[PDB]
Design a protein around this motif. Structure first.
Motif, PDB file in Angstrom:
ATOM      1  N   UNK A  22       0.777  -2.849   3.135  1.00  0.00           N
ATOM      2  CA  UNK A  22      -0.106  -1.528   3.440  1.00  0.00           C
ATOM      3  C   UNK A  22      -0.929  -0.734   4.018  1.00  0.00           C
ATOM      4  N   UNK A  23      -0.183  -1.726   5.319  1.00  0.00           N
ATOM      5  CA  UNK A  23      -0.173  -0.524   6.690  1.00  0.00           C
ATOM      6  C   UNK A  23       0.741   0.013   6.723  1.00  0.00           C
ATOM      7  N   UNK A  24       1.673   0.198   6.657  1.00  0.00           N
ATOM      8  CA  UNK A  24       2.655   0.752   6.226  1.00  0.00           C
ATOM      9  C   UNK A  24       2.561   1.964   5.327  1.00  0.00           C
ATOM     10  N   UNK A  25       2.126   1.830   4.176  1.00  0.00           N
ATOM     11  CA  UNK A  25       1.579   2.747   2.915  1.00  0.00           C
ATOM     12  C   UNK A  25       0.564   4.365   4.141  1.00  0.00           C
ATOM     13  N   UNK A  26      -0.691   3.785   4.259  1.00  0.00           N
ATOM     14  CA  UNK A  26      -2.219   3.838   5.456  1.00  0.00           C
ATOM     15  C   UNK A  26      -0.924   4.878   6.838  1.00  0.00           C
ATOM     16  N   UNK A  27      -0.010   4.053   6.732  1.00  0.00           N
ATOM     17  CA  UNK A  27       0.546   5.771   8.205  1.00  0.00           C
ATOM     18  C   UNK A  27       1.403   6.227   8.115  1.00  0.00           C
ATOM     19  N   UNK A  28       1.432   6.516   6.584  1.00  0.00           N
ATOM     20  CA  UNK A  28       2.382   7.276   5.507  1.00  0.00           C
ATOM     21  C   UNK A  28       0.935   8.912   5.571  1.00  0.00           C
ATOM     22  N   UNK A  29       0.188   8.224   5.448  1.00  0.00           N
ATOM     23  CA  UNK A  29      -0.535   9.385   4.439  1.00  0.00           C
ATOM     24  C   UNK A  29      -1.682   9.628   6.164  1.00  0.00           C
ATOM     25  N   UNK A  30      -2.056   9.250   7.208  1.00  0.00           N
ATOM     26  CA  UNK A  30      -2.646   9.375   8.596  1.00  0.00           C
ATOM     27  C   UNK A  30      -1.718  10.035   8.705  1.00  0.00           C
ATOM     28  N   UNK A  31      -0.567  10.580   8.633  1.00  0.00           N
ATOM     29  CA  UNK A  31       0.880  11.464   9.363  1.00  0.00           C
ATOM     30  C   UNK A  31       0.309  13.058   9.152  1.00  0.00           C
ATOM     31  N   UNK A  32       0.311  13.567   7.895  1.00  0.00           N
ATOM     32  CA  UNK A  32      -0.163  14.127   7.321  1.00  0.00           C
ATOM     33  C   UNK A  32      -2.126  14.579   7.545  1.00  0.00           C
ATOM     34  N   UNK A  33      -2.482  15.508   8.593  1.00  0.00           N
ATOM     35  CA  UNK A  33      -3.751  14.749   9.697  1.00  0.00           C
ATOM     36  C   UNK A  33      -4.804  15.843   7.806  1.00  0.00           C
ATOM     37  N   UNK A  65      -3.455   8.202  -9.114  1.00  0.00           N
ATOM     38  CA  UNK A  65      -3.400   8.802 -10.289  1.00  0.00           C
ATOM     39  C   UNK A  65      -2.275   8.830 -10.654  1.00  0.00           C
ATOM     40  N   UNK A  66      -0.972   8.025 -10.127  1.00  0.00           N
ATOM     41  CA  UNK A  66       0.194   8.484 -10.074  1.00  0.00           C
ATOM     42  C   UNK A  66       0.513   6.534 -10.227  1.00  0.00           C
ATOM     43  N   UNK A  67       0.227   5.887  -9.716  1.00  0.00           N
ATOM     44  CA  UNK A  67      -0.120   3.819 -10.119  1.00  0.00           C
ATOM     45  C   UNK A  67       0.764   3.556 -11.868  1.00  0.00           C
ATOM     46  N   UNK A  68      -0.473   4.001 -12.689  1.00  0.00           N
ATOM     47  CA  UNK A  68       0.170   3.938 -13.916  1.00  0.00           C
ATOM     48  C   UNK A  68       0.471   5.105 -15.223  1.00  0.00           C
ATOM     49  N   UNK A 118       5.049   6.512  -2.973  1.00  0.00           N
ATOM     50  CA  UNK A 118       3.450   5.439  -2.542  1.00  0.00           C
ATOM     51  C   UNK A 118       2.820   5.116  -3.429  1.00  0.00           C
ATOM     52  N   UNK A 119       2.823   5.916  -4.735  1.00  0.00           N
ATOM     53  CA  UNK A 119       2.621   5.498  -5.721  1.00  0.00           C
ATOM     54  C   UNK A 119       3.714   3.734  -6.409  1.00  0.00           C
ATOM     55  N   UNK A 120       5.430   4.483  -6.353  1.00  0.00           N
ATOM     56  CA  UNK A 120       5.828   2.579  -6.749  1.00  0.00           C
ATOM     57  C   UNK A 120       5.550   1.860  -5.721  1.00  0.00           C
ATOM     58  N   UNK A 121       5.082   2.091  -4.566  1.00  0.00           N
ATOM     59  CA  UNK A 121       4.688   0.996  -3.550  1.00  0.00           C
ATOM     60  C   UNK A 121       3.621   0.025  -4.329  1.00  0.00           C
ATOM     61  N   UNK A 122       2.069   0.927  -4.501  1.00  0.00           N
ATOM     62  CA  UNK A 122       1.283   0.118  -5.387  1.00  0.00           C
ATOM     63  C   UNK A 122       1.706  -0.694  -6.827  1.00  0.00           C
TER      64      UNK A 122
END
Ligand SMILES: [Zn+2]
Ligand SMILES: [Zn+2]
Ligand SMILES: [Zn+2]
Ligand SMILES: [Zn+2]
Ligand SMILES: [Zn+2]
Lengths: 150, 123
Positions: free
Chosen positions: A56-67, A79-82, B43-47
């Motif tokens: 979770x922490x790793x995923x969040x840090x990849x989102x913050x990197x783009x301000x 929207x890409x998970x399923x 990120x979606x594959x990780x979730x």
């Protein structure tokens, strides 16, 4: 009207905001099921956030990197998970659990206003994209029954 | 089988290697396969991996082993597609047609064969 959406938004919104502020909202609530679902979510979501905290922490840090507003970035991911054609309760709790994790980060950086849109964006993905699946599974009643054996 | 954890662990290392490769690429080109989309797909594959781990955990004493294999294979094929997209971009491919050909593949081997074909005949 759209009761499944209304109920889902209430459960998700409560869980996210109480995880962010550390306080239980003393407000009354499909009454009994919504209480049983928020309760199941508290137990299950607690375990998910602890067990998979590093992911979770790793995923969040990849989102913050783009301000950018973290919620806008996250909605684009959810929207890409399923997109593999698979839907299950584990993936659903993970989306809400990650939303709760993000809601805490939003509370840390003084951006609690974007918490309501977060819960609504997650509810939009679950209800407006998986309505047929949720209905077949008995909605939030199938949610409580899956996570608790009787 | 015991090899469900190794393939899942291998998927994580591949994702990490892709992120590093993208970070370097940006520092000094397809349809549904631009730098922005690839990051979201990762990120979606990780979730999805965490989600299915939670599904397996609660399903016991409440997705067969076959379905787990299918889902791992689908994640691997998608990683294979992402990697082929970065390679095509680095080799000069700018036409969306080739990136879309890659995305139609069913297996990592299909991705490999298509990517090899495009590098050999369409570069
Ligand atoms: Zn942030
Ligand atoms: Zn996208
Ligand atoms: Zn190569
Ligand atoms: Zn080959
Ligand atoms: Zn050709």
């Amino acid at each position: 009207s759209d009761e499944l959406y209304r109920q889902s938004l209430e459960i998700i919104s409560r869980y996210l905001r109480e995880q962010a502020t550390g306080a239980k909202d003393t407000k009354p609530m499909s009454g009994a099921t919504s209480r049983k679902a928020l309760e199941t979510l508290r137990r299950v979501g607690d375990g998910v956030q602890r067990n998979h905290e590093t992911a979770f922490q790793g995923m969040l840090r990849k989102l913050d990197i783009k301000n950018e507003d973290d919620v806008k970035s996250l909605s684009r991911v959810m929207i890409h998970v399923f997109s593999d054609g698979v839907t299950n309760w584990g993936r659903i709790v993970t989306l809400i659990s990650f939303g709760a994790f993000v809601a805490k980060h939003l509370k840390t950086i003084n951006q609690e206003s974007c918490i309501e849109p977060l819960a609504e964006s997650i509810t939009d993905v679950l209800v407006r994209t998986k309505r047929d699946w949720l209905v077949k599974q008995r909605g939030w009643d199938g949610f409580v029954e899956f996570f608790h054996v009787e | 089988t015991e090899q469900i954890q190794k393939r899942t662990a291998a998927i994580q290392k591949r994702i990490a290697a892709i992120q590093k490769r993208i970070y370097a690429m940006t520092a000094s080109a397809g349809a549904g396969m631009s730098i922005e989309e690839i990051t979201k797909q990762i990120a979606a594959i990780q979730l999805r991996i965490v989600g299915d781990q939670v599904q397996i955990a609660y399903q016991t004493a409440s997705m067969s082993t076959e379905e787990i294999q299918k889902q791992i294979a689908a994640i691997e094929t998608q990683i294979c597609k992402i990697e082929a997209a970065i390679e095509l971009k680095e080799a000069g491919i700018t036409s969306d047609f080739y990136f879309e050909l890659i995305n139609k593949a069913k297996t990592c081997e299909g991705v490999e064969a298509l990517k090899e074909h495009i590098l050999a005949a369409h570069t």
